[PDB]
Coordinates of all heavy atoms in Angstrom, one line a residue:
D236 N 6.3 33.9 20.1 CA 7.8 33.8 19.8 C 8.4 32.5 20.1 O 9.5 32.5 20.7 CB 8.5 35.0 20.4 CG 8.0 36.3 19.8 OD1 8.0 36.5 18.6 OD2 7.5 37.2 20.7
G237 N 7.8 31.4 19.8 CA 8.3 30.0 20.0 C 8.1 29.5 21.4 O 8.7 28.4 21.6
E238 N 7.4 30.2 22.3 CA 7.0 29.7 23.6 C 5.5 29.2 23.5 O 4.6 30.1 23.6 CB 7.1 30.8 24.7 CG 8.3 31.6 24.6 CD 9.6 30.9 25.1 OE1 9.5 29.8 25.7 OE2 10.7 31.5 24.9
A239 N 5.2 28.0 23.2 CA 3.8 27.5 23.2 C 3.2 27.4 24.6 O 3.9 27.2 25.5 CB 3.7 26.2 22.4
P240 N 1.9 27.5 24.7 CA 1.3 27.3 26.0 C 1.4 26.0 26.6 O 1.6 25.0 25.8 CB -0.2 27.7 25.8 CG -0.3 28.2 24.3 CD 0.9 27.6 23.6
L241 N 1.3 25.8 27.9 CA 1.3 24.5 28.7 C 2.7 23.9 28.7 O 2.8 22.7 29.1 CB 0.3 23.6 28.1 CG -1.2 24.1 28.0 CD1 -2.1 23.0 27.7 CD2 -1.6 24.9 29.3
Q242 N 3.8 24.7 28.4 CA 5.1 24.1 28.1 C 5.8 23.7 29.5 O 6.4 22.6 29.5 CB 6.0 25.2 27.4 CG 7.2 24.3 26.6 CD 8.3 25.3 26.1 OE1 9.5 25.1 26.4 NE2 7.9 26.3 25.4
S243 N 5.6 24.6 30.5 CA 6.2 24.3 31.8 C 5.4 23.2 32.5 O 6.0 22.7 33.6 CB 6.2 25.6 32.7 OG 4.9 26.1 32.7
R244 N 4.2 22.8 32.1 CA 3.3 22.0 32.8 C 3.7 20.4 32.7 O 4.1 20.0 31.6 CB 1.8 22.2 32.3 CG 1.3 23.6 32.6 CD -0.2 23.6 32.7 NE -0.7 25.0 32.5 CZ -1.9 25.4 32.9 NH1 -2.8 24.6 33.4 NH2 -2.2 26.7 32.7
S245 N 3.5 19.7 33.8 CA 3.8 18.3 34.0 C 2.8 17.5 33.1 O 1.8 18.0 32.7 CB 3.6 17.9 35.4 OG 2.3 17.9 35.8
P246 N 3.1 16.2 32.8 CA 2.2 15.4 31.9 C 0.8 15.3 32.5 O -0.1 15.4 31.8 CB 2.9 14.0 31.9 CG 4.4 14.4 32.1 CD 4.4 15.5 33.0
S247 N 0.7 15.1 33.8 CA -0.7 15.0 34.5 C -1.5 16.3 34.3 O -2.7 16.2 34.0 CB -0.6 14.6 35.9 OG 0.2 15.5 36.6
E248 N -0.8 17.4 34.4 CA -1.4 18.8 34.3 C -1.8 19.0 32.8 O -2.9 19.7 32.6 CB -0.5 19.9 34.9 CG -0.7 20.0 36.4 CD -2.0 20.4 36.8 OE1 -2.5 21.5 36.5 OE2 -2.7 19.5 37.4
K249 N -1.0 18.6 31.9 CA -1.4 18.8 30.4 C -2.6 17.9 30.1 O -3.5 18.4 29.5 CB -0.2 18.3 29.5 CG 1.0 19.2 29.5 CD 2.1 18.7 28.7 CE 3.0 19.7 28.1 NZ 3.8 19.2 26.9
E250 N -2.6 16.6 30.6 CA -3.6 15.6 30.4 C -4.9 16.2 31.0 O -6.0 16.1 30.3 CB -3.2 14.3 31.1 CG -3.9 13.1 30.6 CD -3.2 11.8 30.9 OE1 -2.5 11.8 32.0 OE2 -3.3 10.9 30.2
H251 N -4.9 16.7 32.2 CA -6.1 17.3 33.0 C -6.7 18.5 32.2 O -7.9 18.6 32.2 CB -5.8 17.7 34.4 CG -5.6 16.5 35.3 ND1 -5.9 15.2 34.9 CD2 -5.1 16.4 36.6 CE1 -5.6 14.4 35.9 NE2 -5.2 15.1 36.9
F252 N -5.8 19.3 31.6 CA -6.2 20.5 30.9 C -7.2 20.1 29.8 O -8.2 20.7 29.6 CB -4.9 21.2 30.3 CG -5.2 22.6 29.8 CD1 -5.0 23.7 30.6 CD2 -5.7 22.7 28.5 CE1 -5.3 25.0 30.0 CE2 -6.0 24.0 28.0 CZ -5.8 25.1 28.8
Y253 N -6.8 19.0 29.0 CA -7.7 18.4 27.9 C -8.9 17.8 28.5 O -10.0 18.0 27.9 CB -6.9 17.5 27.1 CG -6.1 18.1 25.9 CD1 -5.8 19.4 26.0 CD2 -5.7 17.4 24.9 CE1 -5.0 20.1 24.9 CE2 -4.9 17.9 23.8 CZ -4.6 19.3 23.9 OH -3.9 19.9 22.9
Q254 N -8.8 17.0 29.6 CA -9.9 16.2 30.2 C -11.0 17.2 30.7 O -12.1 16.8 30.6 CB -9.3 15.2 31.2 CG -8.6 14.1 30.5 CD -7.9 13.1 31.4 OE1 -7.9 13.3 32.6 NE2 -7.3 12.0 30.9
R255 N -10.5 18.3 31.2 CA -11.4 19.4 31.8 C -11.9 20.3 30.6 O -12.8 21.2 30.9 CB -10.7 20.2 32.9 CG -10.4 19.3 34.1 CD -9.4 19.9 35.1 NE -9.0 19.0 36.1 CZ -8.0 19.1 36.9 NH1 -7.1 20.0 36.8 NH2 -7.8 18.1 37.8
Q256 N -11.3 20.2 29.4 CA -11.6 21.0 28.3 C -11.4 22.5 28.6 O -12.2 23.3 28.2 CB -13.1 20.8 27.8 CG -13.2 19.4 27.1 CD -14.6 19.2 26.4 OE1 -15.1 18.1 26.3 NE2 -15.2 20.3 26.0
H257 N -10.3 22.8 29.3 CA -9.9 24.2 29.5 C -9.6 24.8 28.1 O -9.1 24.1 27.3 CB -8.7 24.3 30.5 CG -9.1 24.1 31.9 ND1 -10.1 24.8 32.5 CD2 -8.5 23.3 32.9 CE1 -10.2 24.4 33.8 NE2 -9.2 23.5 34.0
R258 N -9.9 26.1 28.0 CA -9.7 26.9 26.7 C -8.2 27.3 26.8 O -7.8 27.8 27.9 CB -10.6 28.0 26.5 CG -12.1 27.5 26.3 CD -12.4 26.4 25.4 NE -11.9 26.6 24.0 CZ -12.6 27.4 23.2 NH1 -13.7 28.0 23.5 NH2 -12.1 27.5 21.9
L259 N -7.4 27.1 25.7 CA -6.1 27.7 25.5 C -6.1 29.2 25.5 O -7.1 29.8 25.1 CB -5.4 27.1 24.3 CG -5.0 25.6 24.4 CD1 -4.7 25.0 23.0 CD2 -3.8 25.5 25.3
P260 N -5.0 29.9 25.8 CA -5.0 31.4 25.8 C -5.3 32.0 24.4 O -5.1 31.3 23.4 CB -3.7 31.8 26.3 CG -2.8 30.5 26.2 CD -3.7 29.4 26.3
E261 N -5.9 33.1 24.4 CA -6.2 34.0 23.2 C -5.1 35.1 23.2 O -4.9 35.8 24.1 CB -7.6 34.7 23.3 CG -8.7 33.7 23.2 CD -10.0 34.4 22.9 OE1 -10.6 35.1 23.8 OE2 -10.5 34.2 21.8
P262 N -4.5 35.3 22.0 CA -3.7 36.5 21.8 C -4.4 37.8 21.9 O -5.7 37.7 21.9 CB -3.2 36.3 20.3 CG -3.4 34.9 20.0 CD -4.6 34.5 20.8
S263 N -3.8 38.9 22.1 CA -4.4 40.3 22.3 C -4.9 40.9 21.0 O -5.7 41.8 21.0 CB -3.5 41.2 23.1 OG -2.3 41.5 22.3
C264 N -4.5 40.3 19.8 CA -5.1 40.7 18.5 C -6.4 39.9 18.4 O -6.4 38.7 18.1 CB -4.1 40.2 17.4 SG -5.0 40.3 15.7
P265 N -7.5 40.7 18.5 CA -8.9 40.0 18.6 C -9.3 39.2 17.3 O -9.9 38.2 17.5 CB -9.8 41.2 18.7 CG -9.1 42.4 18.1 CD -7.6 42.1 18.4
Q266 N -8.9 39.7 16.1 CA -9.2 39.0 14.8 C -8.4 37.6 14.7 O -9.0 36.7 14.2 CB -9.0 39.9 13.7 CG -10.0 41.1 13.6 CD -9.8 41.9 12.3 OE1 -9.7 41.4 11.2 NE2 -9.8 43.2 12.5

Side-chain angles (χ1 to χ4, degrees):
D236 296 305
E238 319 285 351
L241 307 191
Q242 208 192 124
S243 56
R244 297 204 196 197
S245 72
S247 55
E248 275 300 291
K249 291 176 150 201
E250 201 164 30
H251 287 350
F252 192 96
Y253 274 20
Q254 291 175 353
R255 292 165 187 164
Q256 289 188 208
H257 285 309
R258 301 310 303 283
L259 286 164
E261 294 196 289
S263 63
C264 169
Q266 287 185 50

